[PDB]
Design a binder for this molecule. Structure first.
Ligand SMILES: CC(C)(O)c1ccc2cncc(NC(=O)[C@@H]3CCNc4ccc(Cl)cc43)c2c1
Ligand SMILES: CC(C)(O)c1ccc2cncc(NC(=O)[C@@H]3CCNc4ccc(Cl)cc43)c2c1
Ligand SMILES: [Cl-]
Lengths: 296, 303
């Protein structure tokens, strides 16, 4: 029993974190094989980069200096070829995630990991992270079997205190740019499929006060959800919730009627899994994995 | 900016997790140097748990009855001893991945990271706190016994918890790494129940200072309180008494924000009376008590 915001074990990623310094800027890099990946803002990026020599980039792995033997830019990521291959390189993939998907973040400063937390890519493409100055280059990941799927690299903080970054191929999530200009997060919405997954997690853990005898259609549910700034629920979302619906005996549209009632009436002084707000940062897969004990 | 329930990076602990099997029971062990530490109930059947005589069950076991697996390698047990509710299995191989470590016994209100494991394999990491009633609100399934709680301030891992059991309310009970239980619990299937739980007051205050550091002051008021009047009000909401030690510990956060501890206490009194009126504090509609003054200073900015 119990339900926590759980992150993947970070060990396979910790062994890849390095510190990258160029001039007066110090940030984090990801060392995989003989390449160090980091935000290109550490250095017109083509014009600024062509003026740099390999020895201008100082890369430190623990108490050992790695020597940069080459450099290239791919979108908003700088790839620094080093002379030493990381002996701790895990099995890995670079994957681009969609809004609503979750991942673990290993927050680092000066190439040293300080903490790990779980978060979701918001529908407005920002992440509600916990980052201070020097955290640039910290990475987001998931683990599938023994393979680390890197999905995020931290680049910046927006004026509202939320965060923006790229995939490991340097493509930003959202309409953001890596420079000092007027940028703002768009109006955010609630990830509906995730709230429903969390409601199924509450039922699995014995919290059932919000269940009712009613059902709804997908269309009537979507009309109500649009009014409360909830993301539209698709047939794909209904299909993805199938396993949780079979384990609890509560049809997806049956749970949608509970959600409709919670949006229209509130919680009435009651909590769900120790929360007075409807939680949207657990996917259906996260609920299944935590309520089944999947290991890595 | 931002404030999250943040756990310590788990790598140093992952390299210590092993699987321990005795008869039909399989659980997790912690391999540090040439010793594997695990809950002593690994030698019990379900029937034995009603009234186990651990000394009698242990004397019937030899070294080769304990199977210890580290990854895909079997470790050989060359000795065994019991220390309180922990079994210590001497193995023939020292763990090459043994980090710098200490065994520390924590007090209620203290936080720590948990690496939840099954079959000697880590599945997840989360942050939690030792409740005033000595239980932890964890996320543990059957097979998670032997999973450990820790802090990593600098390069040293301080092991503070080993998971032993789940109570009827769904909360969890365990021991320090010397096998002494936290709370009045026994590693026996007996009618045990968690005592009435209370809110960790010093931690709620720390989290209110974290909200001020991050730019939110809506909850402050023009009042102050004496420590005794604060505690008379706090006890009515099932909040732990606030001691002079707690006031001292909040000193640094009080200096960084310019808000006296008893003025923050007055704000807490008003939040308990009024609720939040549709507002949130650091993205929460409830008063959060699982961040210590130390965790706030660690995660929040100095400016
Ligand atoms: C407020 C403060 C100290 O600058 C800060 C506070 C918290 C931060 C958290 N995560 C990242 C940060 N860096 C940036 O956002 C950097 C520096 C500012 N300008 C800028 C412009 C473009 C790009 Cl791609 C990056 C940055 C943080 C910075
Ligand atoms: C209730 C259920 C399914 O057995 C379960 C569910 C979740 C659990 C989570 N963490 C540990 C668990 N094991 C125990 O509590 C074991 C087995 C039952 N009795 C018992 C009595 C005393 C002692 Cl010291 C240990 C145990 C869990 C078990
Ligand atoms: Cl302590």
């Amino acid at each position: 029993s119990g339900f926590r915001k759980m992150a993947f074990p970070s060990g396979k990623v910790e062994g890849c974190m390095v510190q990258v310094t160029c001039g007066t800027t110090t940030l984090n890099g990801l060392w995989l094989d003989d390449v160090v990946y980091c935000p290109r803002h550490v250095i017109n990026y083509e014009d600024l980069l062509i003026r740099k020599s390999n020895h201008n980039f100082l890369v430190q792995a623990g108490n050992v200096q790695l020597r940069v033997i080459g450099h290239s830019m791919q979108n908003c990521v700088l790839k620094l070829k080093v002379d030493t291959a990381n002996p701790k390189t895990p099995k890995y993939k670079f994957v681009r995630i969609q809004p609503g998907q979750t991942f673990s973040v290993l927050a680092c400063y000066n190439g040293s990991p300080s903490g790990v937390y779980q978060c979701a890519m918001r529908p407005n493409f920002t992440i509600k992270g916990s980052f201070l100055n020097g955290s640039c280059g910290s990475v987001g990941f998931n683990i599938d079997y023994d393979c680390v799927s890197f999905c995020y690299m931290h680049h910046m903080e927006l004026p509202t205190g939320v965060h923006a970054g790229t995939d490991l191929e340097g493509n930003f999530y959202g309409p953001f740019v890596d420079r000092q200009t007027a940028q703002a997060a768009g109006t955010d919405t609630t990830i509906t499929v995730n709230v429903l997954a969390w409601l199924y997690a509450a039922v699995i853990n014995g919290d059932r006060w919000f269940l009712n005898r009613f059902t709804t259609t997908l269309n009537d549910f979507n009309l109500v959800a649009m009014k409360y700034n909830y993301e539209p629920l698709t047939q794909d979302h209904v299909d993805i919730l199938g396993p949780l619906s079979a384990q609890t005996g509560i049809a997806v549209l049956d749970m949608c009627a509970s959600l409709k009632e919670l949006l229209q009436n509130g919680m009435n002084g009651r909590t769900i899994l120790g929360s007075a707000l409807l939680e949207d940062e657990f996917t259906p897969f996260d609920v299944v994995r935590q309520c089944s004990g999947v290991t890595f």
